Write a protein that binds this ligand. Structure first.
Ligand SMILES: [Ca+2]
Lengths: 213, 183
């Protein structure tokens, strides 16, 4: 019971059921080519290594097919024809679905680190490129006093490309974290006790002002 | 504020989502890893949520009469005859009744008795639960089934439940005792 998450069991099930079957088929193809065909008194034979069979099955599973290594026993060939019909069918799930699951990780996990000299403020609620840019443009404006406050965004979603760009431009005094102020763990991630203030922004253009309040 | 109060008024809150229990109270170190029954508001009895009933399915299969014991305590005595009478669609009928039936006007209730003053006070000053149990059942026909104690001693008003404490468990003069009593 070490694999807690549904996605982790799924992946590990996908990975291991791909490493098995691949290793297994390499052994079966290696047997069929190195034995030769029984129909031809084992005279028709081809001395592959097991590693050349692993390689050959990867270049056929991927449908690349160089043909630098290729099957030559009739049984072998057959097995390749059967194997292609299986592993085109296993293009449903496997490589695309493991890439999906392995990509669904959280980019903006982790914690703020509080220096002793710096102050910070935590900003949450409605966070978007337009609201953040309107906020930053006034909060860090040149006419404002030369205070050195860091701004920590906390929001329950992935930032859009233009917001990642804005955050990159200000990365010297701005941070963003995935999470919600509804969760006491996320309040610790952003070190809210040491924060100087917390700002809650509102979606002024929401479908119902009373639900936003 | 109620000057001629506040956090001293007794409350119970029916929660719809157990994890919102965090917000009912302060000085309580909230953590969403913690299942509802361990949280301070539930231990104080100020927070109820429907999830704590979900084991009653098991208890029925394994001991039907233990659910009928629950049903008779918590309803105050809603017998199968009353839900038959209600299913007839007339609503609760009733009027002055035979002394006969009135006999059932004596049932065990759960109740709270304080050990601050009164005959049992003695056990309060240093005694141990055990003694009380015995003295009570013996002299008053009263079972003691637990304590409701102040969480803070030395200063908030919050108290917590203690189901059936050990025989050698020390009492305080501020404790309240849950009891089953016939009068
Ligand atoms: Ca709390």
């Amino acid at each position: 019971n070490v694999l807690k998450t549904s996605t982790l069991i799924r992946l590990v099930q996908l990975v291991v059921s791909f490493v098995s079957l691949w290793l297994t088929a390499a052994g079966f193809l290696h047997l069929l080519e190195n034995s030769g065909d029984p129909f031809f008194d084992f005279g028709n034979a081809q001395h592959l290594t097991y590693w050349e069979c692993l390689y050959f099955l990867m270049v056929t599973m991927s449908t690349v097919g160089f043909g630098d290594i290729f099957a030559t026993t009739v049984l072998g060939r057959t097995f390749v024809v059967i194997f292609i019909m299986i592993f085109i069918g296993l293009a449903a799930s496997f490589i695309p679905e493991i890439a999906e699951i392995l990509g669904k990780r959280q980019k903006y996990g982790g914690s703020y680190k509080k220096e002793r000299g710096k102050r910070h403020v935590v900003v949450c609620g409605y966070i978007t490129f337009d609201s953040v840019s309107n906020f930053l443009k006034d909060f860090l404006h040149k006419d404002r006093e030369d205070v050195d406050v860091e701004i920590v965004f906390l929001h329950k979603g992935l930032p859009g490309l233009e917001l990642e760009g804005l955050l990159k431009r200000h990365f010297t005094q701005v941070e963003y974290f995935w999470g919600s102020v509804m969760d006491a763990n996320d309040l610790e991630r952003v070190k809210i006790q040491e924060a100087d203030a917390c700002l809650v922004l509102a979606n002024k253009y929401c479908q119902d002002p009373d639900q936003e309040d | 504020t109620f000057d001629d109060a506040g956090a001293n008024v007794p409350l119970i809150t029916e929660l719809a989502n157990d994890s919102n229990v965090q917000f009912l109270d302060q000085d309580d170190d909230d953590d969403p890893d913690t299942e509802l029954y361990m949280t301070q508001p539930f231990a104080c009895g100020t927070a109820f949520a429907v999830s704590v009933l979900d084991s009653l399915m098991s208890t029925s299969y394994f001991n039907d009469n233990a659910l009928t014991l629950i049903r008779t305590l918590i309803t105050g005595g809603a017998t199968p005859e009353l839900e038959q009478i209600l299913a007839e669609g007339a609503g609760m009928r009733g009027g002055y009744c035979s002394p006969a039936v009135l006999a059932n006007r004596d049932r065990c209730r759960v109740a709270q008795i304080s050990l601050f003053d009164g005959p049992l006070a003695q056990f309060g000053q240093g005694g141990h639960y055990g003694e009380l149990f015995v003295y009570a059942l013996r002299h008053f026909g009263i079972l003691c089934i637990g304590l409701y104690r102040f969480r803070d001693t030395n200063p908030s008003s919050k108290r917590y439940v203690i189901t059936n404490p050990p025989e050698d468990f020390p009492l305080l003069p501020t404790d309240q005792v849950y009891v089953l009593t016939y009068k």
